[PDB]
Amino acid sequence: HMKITVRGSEMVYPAAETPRRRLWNSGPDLVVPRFHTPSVYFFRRRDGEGNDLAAADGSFFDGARMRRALAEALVPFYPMAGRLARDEDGRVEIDCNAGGVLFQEADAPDATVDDFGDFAPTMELKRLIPTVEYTDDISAFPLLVVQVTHFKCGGVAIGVGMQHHVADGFSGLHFINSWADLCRGVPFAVMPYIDRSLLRARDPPTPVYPHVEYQPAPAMLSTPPAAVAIFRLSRADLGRLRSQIPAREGVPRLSTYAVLAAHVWRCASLARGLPADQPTKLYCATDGRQRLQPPLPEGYFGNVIFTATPLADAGTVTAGVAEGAAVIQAALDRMDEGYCRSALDYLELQPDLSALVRGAHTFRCPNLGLTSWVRLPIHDADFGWGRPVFMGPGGIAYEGLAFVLPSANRDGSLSVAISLQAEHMEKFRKFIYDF
Numbered sequence: 001h002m003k004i005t006v007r008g009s010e011m012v013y014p015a016a017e018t019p020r021r022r023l024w025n026s027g028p029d030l031v032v033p034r035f036h037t038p039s040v041y042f043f044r045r046r047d048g049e050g051n052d053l054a055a056a057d058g059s060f061f062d063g064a065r066m067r068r069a070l071a072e073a074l075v076p077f078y079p080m081a082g083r084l085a086r087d088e089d090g091r092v093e094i095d096c097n098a099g100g101v102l103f104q105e106a107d108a109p110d111a112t113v114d115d116f117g118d119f120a121p122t123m124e125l126k127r128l129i130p131t132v133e134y135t136d137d138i139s140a141f142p143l144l145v146v147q148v149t150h151f152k153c154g155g156v157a158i159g160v161g162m163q164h165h166v167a168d169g170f171s172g173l174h175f176i177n178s179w180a181d182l183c184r185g186v187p188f189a190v191m192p193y194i195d196r197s198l199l200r201a202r203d204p205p206t207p208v209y210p211h212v213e214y215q216p217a218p219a220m221l222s223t224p225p226a227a228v229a230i231f232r233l234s235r236a237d238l239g240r241l242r243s244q245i246p247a248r249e250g251v252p253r254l255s256t257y258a259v260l261a262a263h264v265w266r267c268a269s270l271a272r273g274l275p276a277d278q279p280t281k282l283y284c285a286t287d288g289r290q291r292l293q294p295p296l297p298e299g300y301f302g303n304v305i306f307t308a309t310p311l312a313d314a315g316t317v318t319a320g321v322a323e324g325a326a327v328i329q330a331a332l333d334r335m336d337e338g339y340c341r342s343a344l345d346y347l348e349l350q351p352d353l354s355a356l357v358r359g360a361h362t363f364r365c366p367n368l369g370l371t372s373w374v375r376l377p378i379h380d381a382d383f384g385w386g387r388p389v390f391m392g393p394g395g396i397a398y399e400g401l402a403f404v405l406p407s408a409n410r411d412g413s414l415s416v417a418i419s420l421q422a423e424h425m426e427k428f429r430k431f432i433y434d435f
């Protein structure tokens with residue numbers, strides 16, 4: 001257990017006038033998981049070639065500079081400085097009240113960036129993000145909490161906790177990367193678009209699918225300690241996995257996500273010892289920006305996550321990657337404009353969206369969640385002292401939940417960070433390379 005000492009904490013507020021208003025949240029904003037999404041950045045003090053990355057003025061993640069840029073970033077991104085609240089009907093919304101965000105600095109005088117190893121999202125990493133106390137008062141806590149930790153090596157971590165109602169990964173990183181840009185002294189490219197009514201349902205709502213993704217996950221037909229780990233597959237490993245799927249003249253090419261996801265689903269199902277007739281459901285967060293037509297404004301600030309949920313008997317998934325990948329890709333291919341549009345209507349008709357919130361019961365054995373960050377700009381946060389050498393989830397709250405990460409370098413590898421029951425992880429560790 002690492003010695004981390006927090007220097008002290010500050011609420012940081014927008015540095016100019018911002019609108020005082022209630023901000024309506026869309027259906028997709030309300031069914032993402034509860035609490036604050038964790039992510040952690042690591043930065044080394046030297047670049048690969050060994051030069052010090054401190055700036056000409058000697059600075060290296062100077063807190064004052066970072067806080068000034070943060071306060072500037074919270075002007076156009078002002079809902080990030082707000083608080084949760086409810087409207088008259090009890091629907092959660094964002095109270096844009098300039099309550100501010102938490103920023104704190106810490107020192108870990110004994111540890112180095114090297115000490116974190118593969119950067120698996122264990123509790124070791126979670127300690128790099130401020131802790132939030134949740135009570136029944138949902139207005140009580142900041143929507144954004146940040147910690148900057150300084151290490152013995154001269155390295156730094158930035159831990160980010162971002163309340164999920166405010167933004168999905170694309171919008172959340174749009175904020176962090178804009179903050180980084182300001183800190184670095186460059187204007188940022190894209191102003192956020194703040195109005196979420198663009199994702200309002202049609203009137204009357206007219207859903208035209210069952211929306212399997214919002215139905216209860218399968219239970220076992222028939223508390224445990226939960227382990228967390230990270231596994232890299234090289235570009236060569238990924239190619240060999242793909243080459244195991246027959247290429248036939250009729251049949252269109254499966255996505256890499258579908259191939260890798262099928263492999264993870266297969267390995268997890270085997271590790272868990274699922275019987276062939278056990279239904280299993282895989283939850284795949286899908287970015288609706290790439291699917292809605294016409295597309296949303298470029299800087300649209302919110303969640304645009306729709307959910308693809310391949311569902312099959314475990315015997316199908318474990319029979320082989322090819323069979324699983326076909327099922328996943330079909331589920332992904334369903335998520336077009338017509339489908340995503342229908343989903344908005346379907347959510348509008350629900351008496352209570354809190355019931356659909358994805359959580360532990362969603363992802364746990366026999367089911368799985370596999371969220372890709374591969375196309376997210378997770379490595380673009382250069383505050384003026386270099387790009388991060390790693391970025392990933394700061395923890396995994398739920399057994400059965402996993403992340404696909406792109407490499408921080410150019411080598412074309414992918415990493416899978418995953419939480420499973422401890423006994424199952426011991427098998428999964430072996431199985432993920434057993435092909």
Ligand SMILES: CC(C)(COP(=O)(O)OP(=O)(O)OC[C@H]1O[C@@H](n2cnc3c(N)ncnc32)[C@H](O)[C@@H]1OP(=O)(O)O)[C@@H](O)C(=O)NCCC(=O)NCCS
Nearest residue numbers: 168169170255256257284285286287332371372373374375
């Ligand atoms: C399938 C999906 C659900 C997840 O997959 P993904 O890992 O993010 O990546 P995608 O399927 O979108 O595209 C990656 C592909 O485009 C390739 N690619 C790389 N650069 C590219 C570029 N300029 N242009 C086009 N394709 C490119 C990639 O190599 C890859 O090709 P492949 O599948 O044949 O290997 C996708 O639809 C998606 O939603 N991505 C965003 C995920 C997200 O936001 N998750 C949650 C954050 S809250």
Ligand SMILES: O=C(/C=C/c1ccc(O)cc1)O[C@@H]1CC(C(=O)O)=C[C@@H](O)[C@H]1O
Nearest residue numbers: 032037039162168169172173285358371
């Ligand atoms: O992946 C994200 C959020 C990413 C993100 C990254 C960096 C940020 O700054 C903010 C958010 O949301 C995921 C969405 C999700 C779901 O069921 O919809 C389940 C989890 O996998 C979340 O972690």
